[PDB]
């Protein structure tokens, strides 16, 4: 970007920039990802494939299209994009299950096979014991964990008293 | 004369602080 | 015996403890409610008795020690909240 | 309590010591602090009596224990769903009133600032 006035447009520049963006996605440094993306012209963001792929992957990751995130491996712009993809994928699974615990109250054992994108049924068992998922006799994983509600059972009387005391201060301490 | 001016300014600042403290105290008692 | 959070006695519990039939349990509570031994209400739909007050009884020394420990916790809470109010409203406190 | 002339004399004697500049709200909050202190003192007295009873310094009265059982029974459960919902609803009902009062106060303060600025501009214009 700096000496680009005298330097010619490198053929591999866009590919390597997309590689950097995909790496930033792999390390969950999305705030840096957008700042570095803004450095590119607004045209090649929607036009150049090497830039189009990582930004689309970011959109899919943010909106929750995890199936498209997994499919992004097949249509990578270049072979060099492969490695970072795996780095992202390990997150996606652990993210997907994070949804499953809070969204699905109970899911079948094989039903998650496409959801968790697991090839071997054996690969479910180790990931489940890592996740500590209580398998049910009917091949159903019971995710009963919403009982840990925001805990409205308790009144935050200390915080409320502090706020009211601050009101009293702002009404009296002014003088 | 630079040092004399600087020291006089320092004394003036400290005197102004004293005056403001006294004024606040006098307001506090003048309300009573 | 039950703590104040768990003073909802099922009809089965009273029937088993008092060696009486379930259908008589309500009547028993009536007497205890009429004399003044206990205070509360009866939810016959759920077959439960919500007891809220007991006739105070003679306590052992160990029970008095436990009561004093409860007072210790209560005093700790009162002191903590008093210090909190004093600290937060120090400027406006007279 | 004091008679009218007795109160006049007391206020004459307490003229310097008594500070009346503190607003009513500060007085009520200080009353709450004093109530907390008094409750702590009373509970500490009860705790000391129970400590003496436990070690045998005093015999079991069997009447103070009767009163203490009632005292501990009277301790309300603030963790109940119905009580928590009622407390939240009441707090919001009072907070909307506080909000309306503060909004009116802010508007009145803006009006006062308007009057002050207008008076200053008129004074500097005539001079």
UniProtKB/Swiss-Prot annotation, chain A:
Keyword field contains Phosphoprotein: yes
Any GO CC annotation of this UniProt entry: proteasome regulatory particle
Keywords carried by this UniProt record: Isopeptide bond, Phosphoprotein, Proteasome, Ubl conjugation
RNA-binding in keyword set: no
A biological process term (GO) from this entry: proteasome-mediated ubiquitin-dependent protein catabolic process
Covalent link (Glycyl lysine isopeptide (Lys-Gly) (interchain with G-Cter in SUMO2)) residue numbers: 122
Annotated PCI domain residues: 1-156
UniProt function note: Component of the 26S proteasome, a multiprotein complex involved in the ATP-dependent degradation of ubiquitinated proteins. This complex plays a key role in the maintenance of protein homeostasis by removing misfolded or damaged proteins, which could impair cellular functions, and by removing proteins whose functions are no longer required. Therefore, the proteasome participates in numerous cellular processes, including cell cycle progression, apoptosis, or DNA damage repair.
Family statement drawn from the similarity comment of this UniProt entry: Belongs to the proteasome subunit S14 family.
Subunit structure and binding partners: Component of the 19S proteasome regulatory particle complex. The 26S proteasome consists of a 20S core particle (CP) and two 19S regulatory subunits (RP). The regulatory particle is made of a lid composed of 9 subunits including PSMD8, a base containing 6 ATPases and few additional components. Interacts with DDI2. Interacts with TASOR.
Protein name: 26S proteasome non-ATPase regulatory subunit 8
Organism: Homo sapiens (Human)
From Swiss-Prot, chain B:
Residues making up the signal peptide according to the UniProt record: none
Annotated disulfide bonds: none
Compartment(s): Cytoplasm; Nucleus
Domain of life assignment: Eukaryota
Function: Component of the 26S proteasome, a multiprotein complex involved in the ATP-dependent degradation of ubiquitinated proteins. This complex plays a key role in the maintenance of protein homeostasis by removing misfolded or damaged proteins, which could impair cellular functions, and by removing proteins whose functions are no longer required. Therefore, the proteasome participates in numerous cellular processes, including cell cycle progression, apoptosis, or DNA damage repair.
Subunit structure: Component of the 19S proteasome regulatory particle complex. The 26S proteasome consists of a 20S core particle (CP) and two 19S regulatory subunits (RP). The regulatory particle is made of a lid composed of 9 subunits, a base containing 6 ATPases including PSMC4 and few additional components. Interacts with NR1I3. Interacts with PAAF1. Interacts with TRIM5. Interacts with ZFAND1.
Family: Belongs to the AAA ATPase family.
Protein name according to UniProt: 26S proteasome regulatory subunit 6B
Taxonomic lineage from the root: Eukaryota, Metazoa, Chordata, Craniata, Vertebrata
Gene label: PSMC4
Curated annotation (Swiss-Prot), chain C:
N6-acetyllysine, modified sites: 16
Membrane-spanning segments: none
Quaternary structure note: Component of the 19S proteasome regulatory particle complex. The 26S proteasome consists of a 20S core particle (CP) and two 19S regulatory subunits (RP). The regulatory particle is made of a lid composed of 9 subunits including PSMD13, a base containing 6 ATPases and few additional components.
Functional summary from the UniProt entry: Component of the 26S proteasome, a multiprotein complex involved in the ATP-dependent degradation of ubiquitinated proteins. This complex plays a key role in the maintenance of protein homeostasis by removing misfolded or damaged proteins, which could impair cellular functions, and by removing proteins whose functions are no longer required. Therefore, the proteasome participates in numerous cellular processes, including cell cycle progression, apoptosis, or DNA damage repair.
Protein family (similarity comment): Belongs to the proteasome subunit S11 family.
Record-given protein name: 26S proteasome non-ATPase regulatory subunit 13
Gene source species: Homo sapiens
Swiss-Prot record, chain D:
Recorded superkingdom: Eukaryota
Modified residues (N6-acetyllysine): 42, 52
Glycyl lysine isopeptide (Lys-Gly) (interchain with G-Cter in ubiquitin) cross-link site: 18
Function, as annotated: Component of the 26S proteasome, a multiprotein complex involved in the ATP-dependent degradation of ubiquitinated proteins. This complex plays a key role in the maintenance of protein homeostasis by removing misfolded or damaged proteins, which could impair cellular functions, and by removing proteins whose functions are no longer required. Therefore, the proteasome participates in numerous cellular processes, including cell cycle progression, apoptosis, or DNA damage repair.
Protein family membership: Belongs to the peptidase M67A family.
Quaternary structure note: Component of the 19S proteasome regulatory particle complex. The 26S proteasome consists of a 20S core particle (CP) and two 19S regulatory subunits (RP). The regulatory particle is made of a lid composed of 9 subunits including PSMD7, a base containing 6 ATPases and few additional components. Within the complex, PSMD7 interacts with subunit PSMD4 through their respective MPN domain. Interacts with TRIM5.
Other known facts: Does not bind a metal ion.
Protein name: 26S proteasome non-ATPase regulatory subunit 7
Parent sequence residues shown: 163 to 289 of 324
